[PDB]
Amino acid sequence: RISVISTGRRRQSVLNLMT
Amino acid sequence: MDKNELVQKAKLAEQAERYDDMAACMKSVTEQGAELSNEERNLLSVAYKNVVGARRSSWRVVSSIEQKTGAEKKQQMAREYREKIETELRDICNDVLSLLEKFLIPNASQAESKVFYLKMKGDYYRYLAEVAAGDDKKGIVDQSQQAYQEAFEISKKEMQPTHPIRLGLALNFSVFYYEILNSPEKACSLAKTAFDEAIAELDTLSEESYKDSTLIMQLLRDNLTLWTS
Amino acid sequence: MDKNELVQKAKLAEQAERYDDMAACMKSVTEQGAELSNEERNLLSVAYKNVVGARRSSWRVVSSIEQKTEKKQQMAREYREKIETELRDICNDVLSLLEKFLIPNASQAESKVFYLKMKGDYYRYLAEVAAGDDKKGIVDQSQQAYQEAFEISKKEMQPTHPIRLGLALNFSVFYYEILNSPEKACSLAKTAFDEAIAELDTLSEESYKDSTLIMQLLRDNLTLWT
Numbered sequence A: 001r002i003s004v005i006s007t008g009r010r011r012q013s014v015l016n017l018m019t
Numbered sequence B: 001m002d003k004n005e006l007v008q009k010a011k012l013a014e015q016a017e018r019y020d021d022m023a024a025c026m027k028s029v030t031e032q033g034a035e036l037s038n039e040e041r042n043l044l045s046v047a048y049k050n051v052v053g054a055r056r057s058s059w060r061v062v063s064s065i066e067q068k069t070g071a072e073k074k075q076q077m078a079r080e081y082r083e084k085i086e087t088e089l090r091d092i093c094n095d096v097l098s099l100l101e102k103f104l105i106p107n108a109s110q111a112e113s114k115v116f117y118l119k120m121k122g123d124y125y126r127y128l129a130e131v132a133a134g135d136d137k138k139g140i141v142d143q144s145q146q147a148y149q150e151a152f153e154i155s156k157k158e159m160q161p162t163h164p165i166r167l168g169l170a171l172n173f174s175v176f177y178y179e180i181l182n183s184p185e186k187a188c189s190l191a192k193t194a195f196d197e198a199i200a201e202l203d204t205l206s207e208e209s210y211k212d213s214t215l216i217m218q219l220l221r222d223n224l225t226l227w228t229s
Numbered sequence C: 001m002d003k004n005e006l007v008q009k010a011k012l013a014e015q016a017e018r019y020d021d022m023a024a025c026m027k028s029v030t031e032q033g034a035e036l037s038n039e040e041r042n043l044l045s046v047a048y049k050n051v052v053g054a055r056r057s058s059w060r061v062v063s064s065i066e067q068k069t070e071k072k073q074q075m076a077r078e079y080r081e082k083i084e085t086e087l088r089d090i091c092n093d094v095l096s097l098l099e100k101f102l103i104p105n106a107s108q109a110e111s112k113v114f115y116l117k118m119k120g121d122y123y124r125y126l127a128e129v130a131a132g133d134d135k136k137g138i139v140d141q142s143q144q145a146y147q148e149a150f151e152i153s154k155k156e157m158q159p160t161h162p163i164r165l166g167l168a169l170n171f172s173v174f175y176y177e178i179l180n181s182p183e184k185a186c187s188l189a190k191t192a193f194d195e196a197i198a199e200l201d202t203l204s205e206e207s208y209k210d211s212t213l214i215m216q217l218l219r220d221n222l223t224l225w226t
């Protein structure tokens, strides 16, 4: 399941998602 | 394609984290001319949030690098890359603002939806303002502020202080003040008023309404804390 | 355009997390025909790993959706095929650079093994989404690339060398996942693990910083697999 490759507080803004 | 095929493809693309595909699907849905359902609106909004968000994040990284580099051909490289990203960003925002003008805002049949789309117009002009320079900037900033202000008046008249969209508008409009107009005092006043008017009615809410409202109330609270400390 | 300039653009694209831009830069660098520096080799590898990785991830999600469902089950299939085409294009892109520039120009065993392993890897990604007739020829090209890398690394590299270890790991995974032959997979990973531990029993110091962690991957597969 594993293979390998070798090498040499911000302000909030909001999106409302109404159901 | 018909609407349902487009909507299901948008949902597939969302699952596959392919947001450009997702946005193209929902743009086509919007362009069929019927008022969007809450679900279609959410898919559209989430798609473009991710598409423009990737550019905003990249822009801030490359802007920072450009500003922190003893000039060289290095600074010019970063400048040009920044401008490449800005063009993508502007095209994305113009697309959204055109959908808002031609379809979304005209078709909005309820106060809730109307405030939502005007807030969204304020947001995407705000993203243009983040990246605007000189002559164009003032005009863009005014367009953002006018969308937000109109959203604000309708929400005040038509919605409960605890409504998540009324609260979320207050949040992003306060961010606009703080960050785009560099007016901290108005930003904090706006945010605090929305917060205080919501707690005063928090007893009205059901178990579920309460959770919706309190999530955005926390965001107002935390922005305020950040800005007054 | 200046190579050093393309390289600095690649690094900018990387920091901005725009990996398609990053890959396009390193591709142009490769096409200039000079042998890649170690830095350039890493940037190229990292760029395409991310680019192809996004499609592989998308492909696995959309396949899993397609399985767990007649009109929706077919929409997924045609989306999956759209993703497969991007994926195949990316793999063919990489495999062409390897064939035309990287592998023939590699003047060191370490670079040559690295690129042959990369060839094995990208043919493996093609085999992950290959169907019917074409799959067997893809699978064979992957195996021959790995095998060629393997023979060189056995002669020229220490058993604990991270590239030699990473090759044994990926080649063993290929045997298991692509050829479904854990008898070959276990044997190769075991032999590779045993040779590396014999070296560490002899020397006082590990020669490379990442040897032991890759060795762990080998044994864990050896224990997980038979």
Ligand SMILES: OC[C@H]1O[C@@](CO)(O[C@H]2O[C@H](CO)[C@@H](O)[C@H](O)[C@H]2O)[C@@H](O)[C@@H]1O
Pocket: B087, B088, B089, B091, B092, B095
């Ligand atoms: O990422 C924005 C950038 O992408 C391009 C294609 O290279 O256009 C895509 O995105 C636009 C904005 O959403 C869409 O209007 C367009 O249909 C889509 O191909 C560029 O044109 C744009 O600058």
Ligand SMILES: OC[C@H]1O[C@@](CO)(O[C@H]2O[C@H](CO)[C@@H](O)[C@H](O)[C@H]2O)[C@@H](O)[C@@H]1O
Pocket: C085, C086, C087, C089, C090, C093
């Ligand atoms: O994502 C793969 C997809 O991208 C396209 C452009 O839409 O091609 C780009 O990626 C290829 C693979 O790395 C490059 O060979 C090509 O030069 C680059 O523009 C498609 O052609 C491809 O399917």
Ligand SMILES: [Cl-]
Pocket: B024, B025, B028
């Ligand atoms: Cl479409």
Ligand SMILES: [Cl-]
Pocket: B007, B037, B039, B040
């Ligand atoms: Cl719907």
Ligand SMILES: [Cl-]
Pocket: B214, B217, B218, B221
């Ligand atoms: Cl609170």
Ligand SMILES: [Cl-]
Pocket: C007, C037, C039, C040
């Ligand atoms: Cl270099």
